[PDB]
């Protein structure tokens, strides 16, 4: 810096902000010849570019001033209306909720942290959970309680145990954050019973549930789950959706649906952070839903990604040595791998890159960073032939790691 010790101007929270060594390493990896399984990007082959071109034309013909002018903080009315009708019909979400458009779901997470969290307030997350949610919430200094996943998602029975223990200490949880369908990073889905059990606990212990659902339309097998929000009789759930993995991420348009008192406060918090979400992309998203193109395109996204999931699951079964385990997602973008014998997957990353493969070590996905033997793999966006070769390279790296 030209200011010398620029840190002298920084706030306390800014002084705690750091670049991640692993993040920086993976950025460098993505530009080289290594087969990276570390990405969290959707595949541009799934972006509906012809439909988008037709919508851009339509916008310049018919809606140009609306798309180009400042918008309201809450969002473009027609997009709000179209999303609530979609959400109603498709998922059974109740029309008594209100809706706000956000600059991606990522912004929704930051607003959640702003509107609900005082320093020390307790937030329950899954272990693992979405890394950037931990990052959004950490600005507001919560305390976390981690609830392990199994193959049927959050172990809600362990959450009950922890709630009773917190109660015995005169403490309570304020928010439970869940990514309950095709989780980033674990790939697994909370079953129906657990969703209903979560909502009983939310009533009994008086907390808010944030359901973050980017991936529910990217279903490749099985039958559709009930959204937690569709079971929410009390108005305790805030449901987050996004166009990032159903349209394209580049428009940065997401939505937040919940109790109108909650949404009103979120609108005021958002006003100061950005004035509105970009209206141009909101009009694109409105045409995409209201014109029926979303409903038509979803099955093409699904046909695209399914064989990539399946190739990766075949390669793991064929190549991985005994002791290695992995999730079996019904949808989404990720498979999550657990190593035997106490291998530390972060230390192992060095070895993996030297054998021509990369993955995200799972440690940063745990709020307590306490689990060291996990990895997140992505199947959406390496070449579909590079999945087999990637998984083989990873398998051989694990074999080498396991010996003397």
Ligand X SMILES: O=C(O)/C=C/CC(=O)O
Ligand Y SMILES: O=C(O)c1cc(O)c2ccccc2n1
In the complex, least distance from residue 232 CB atom to a copy of itself, rounded to whole angstroms? 9
Q: Which residue is nearest to ligand PMP (CB)?
A: 104
390 near ligand 3EE (CB under 6 A): no
217 annotated binding-site participant: yes
d(CA 339, CA 345): 8
221 annotated binding-site participant: no
Please select the residue that binds ligand AKG; options are 126, 213, 232, 259, rule is CB under 6 A: 213
* CA atoms of 170 and 163, how far apart (whole Å): 10
Q: Which of 122, 125, 364, 394 binds ligand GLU (CB under 6 A)?
A: 364
Binding mask 262-291 for ligand PMP (x = CB under 6 A): -------------x----------------
3-class SS string, 93-152: CCCCCEEEEECCHHHHHHHHHHHHCCCCCEEEEEECCCHHHHHHHHCCCCEEEEEEEECC
Separation of alpha carbons 184 and 128, rounded Å: 9
When CB distances are held under 5 to 8 angstroms depending on the partner's kind, the choice from ligand PMP, ligand Y, a copy of itself, none that residue 363 binds is ligand Y
Is residue 372 within the footprint of ligand Y (CB under 6 A)? no
**What is the footprint of ligand PMP within residues 123-162 (CB under 6 A)?**
130
Q: Which helix (H) or strand (E) holds 196?
A: helix 192-204
Answer yes or no whether residue 104 interacts with ligand AKG by CB under 6 A: no
Enter the tokens of residue 269.
């918090």
Q: Looking at beta carbons, which pairs linking 168-173 to residues 24 or more positions away fall under 8 Å?
A: 171/122, 172/122, 172/205, 172/206, 172/207, 173/122, 173/123, 173/124, 173/145, 173/205, 173/207
Query: Does the footprint of ligand AKG cover residue 246 (CB under 6 A)?
Result: yes
How far apart (Å, rounded) are the C-alpha atoms in residues 351 and 359? 11
> How far is Cα 48 from Cα 42, in angstroms, rounded to an integer?
12
Residue 361 binding ligand Y, by CB under 6 A:
yes
The answer to whether residue 376 forms part of the interface with ligand Y (CB under 6 A) is no
369 in a labelled binding site? yes
Q: Which residues pair with 147 in a beta bridge?
A: 126
**Does residue 22 belong to the site contacting ligand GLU (CB under 6 A)?**
yes
Binding to ligand GLU by residue 23, rule CB under 6 A?
yes
Looking at 278-367, list the stretches that DSSP marks H as alpha helix, in order from N- to C-terminal side: 279-290, 293-319, 345-354
From a copy of itself, ligand PMP, ligand X, none, interface partner of 212 (C-beta below 5 to 8 A by class): ligand PMP
Per the DSSP assignment, residues forming a β-bridge with 331 are 219
Q: Which does 242 bind (CB under 5 to 8 A by kind): ligand PMP, ligand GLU, ligand 3EE, none?
A: ligand PMP
Strands 153-154 and 143-150: antiparallel
Residue of 157, 195, 162, 161 whose CA lies nearest to 178: 195
222 annotated to bind ligand: no
- Residue found by looking up tokens 């928010």 in the block: 175
Q: Considering only 13-21, 36-44, 255-263, 289-297, which stretch makes contact with ligand 3EE by CB under 6 A? A: 36-44
39 makes contact with ligand 3EE (CB under 6 A)? yes
Pick out residues in 272-291 that bind ligand 3EE (CB under 6 A).
Answer: 275
Q: Is 27 annotated as a binding residue?
A: no
* 399 annotated to bind ligand: no
Partner touching 30 among ligand AKG, ligand 3EE, ligand X, none, CB below 5 to 8 Å by kind:
ligand 3EE
Looking at residue 373, what DSSP letter applies? S
Q: Across-strand partners of 150? A: 153
Which tokens in the block code for residue 286? 């409105």
Strands 325-326 and 254-258: unpaired
Residue 259 or 363: the one with the smaller Cβ distance to ligand Y is: 363
Contact segment (CB under 6 A) with ligand X among 14-22, 125-133, 143-151, 347-355 equals 125-133
Q: Does 9 bind ligand 3EE (CB under 6 A)?
A: no
Do you find a cis peptide bond into 128, omega within 30 degrees of 0?
Answer: yes
Residues in contact with ligand Y by the rule CB under 6 A: 20-23, 131, 346, 360-361, 363-364
Residues in contact with ligand GLU by the rule CB under 6 A: 20, 22-23, 131, 360-361, 364
User: Binding site residues for pyridoxal 5'-phosphate, as ranges?
Assistant: 70, 105-106, 130, 184, 215, 242, 244, 252
User: Binding site residues for 2-oxoglutarate, as ranges?
Assistant: 216-217, 227, 242
């Amino acid at each position: 810096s030209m200011l010398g010790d620029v840190e002298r101007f920084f706030s306390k929270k800014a002084l705690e902000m750091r670049a991640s060594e692993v993040r920086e390493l993976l950025k460098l990896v993505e530009t080289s010849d290594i087969i990276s399984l570390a990405g969290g990007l959707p595949n541009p082959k799934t972006f509906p570019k012809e439909i988008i071109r037709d919508i851009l034309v339509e916008i310049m013909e018919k809606y140009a001033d609306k798309a180009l002018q400042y918008g309201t903080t809450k969002g473009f009315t027609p997009l709000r209306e179209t999303l609530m009708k979609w959400l109603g019909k498709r998922y059974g979400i109740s029309q008594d909720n209100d809706i706000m458009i956000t600059s991606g779901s990522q912004q929704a997470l930051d607003l959640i942290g702003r509107v609900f969290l005082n320093p020390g307030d307790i937030v329950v997350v899954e272990a693992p959970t979405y890394l950037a949610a931990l990052q959004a919430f950490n600005f507001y200094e919560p305390q976390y309680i981690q609830i392990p996943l199994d193959d049927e998602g959050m172990k809600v029975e362990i959450l009950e145990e922890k709630l009773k223990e917190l109660k015995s200490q005169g403490k309570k949880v304020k928010v439970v954050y869940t990514v309950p369908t095709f989780q980033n990073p674990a790939g697994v889905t909370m079953n129906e019973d657990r969703r209903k059990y979560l909502l009983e606990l939310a009533s009994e212990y008086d907390f808010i549930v944030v359901e973050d659902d980017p991936y529910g339309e990217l279903r490749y097998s099985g039958n559709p789950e009930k959204k937690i929000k569709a079971l929410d009789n009390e108005g305790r759930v805030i449901y987050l959706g996004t166009f990032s993995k159903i349209l394209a991420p580049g428009f940065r348009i997401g939505w937040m649906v919940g109790d109108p008192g909650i949404i009103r406060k979120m609108e005021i918090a958002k006003q100061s952070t950005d004035l509105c979400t970009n209206v141009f992309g909101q009009v694109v998203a409105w045409r995409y839903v209201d014109g029926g193109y979303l409903e038509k395109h979803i099955p093409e996204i699904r046909k695209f990604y399914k064989p990539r999931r399946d190739a990766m699951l075949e390669a793991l079964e064929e190549f991985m040595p005994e002791g290695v385990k992995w999730t079996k997602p019904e949808g989404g973008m990720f498979i999550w791998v657990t190593l035997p014998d106490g291998i530390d997957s972060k230390k192992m990353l060095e070895r993996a890159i030297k054998k021509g493969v990369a993955y995200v070590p799972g440690e940063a996905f745990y709020a307590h960073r306490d689990v060291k033997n996990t990895m997140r793999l992505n199947f959406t966006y390496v070449d579909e032939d590079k999945i087999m070769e990637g998984i083989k390279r990873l398998a051989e790296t694990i074999k080498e790691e396991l010996k003397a």
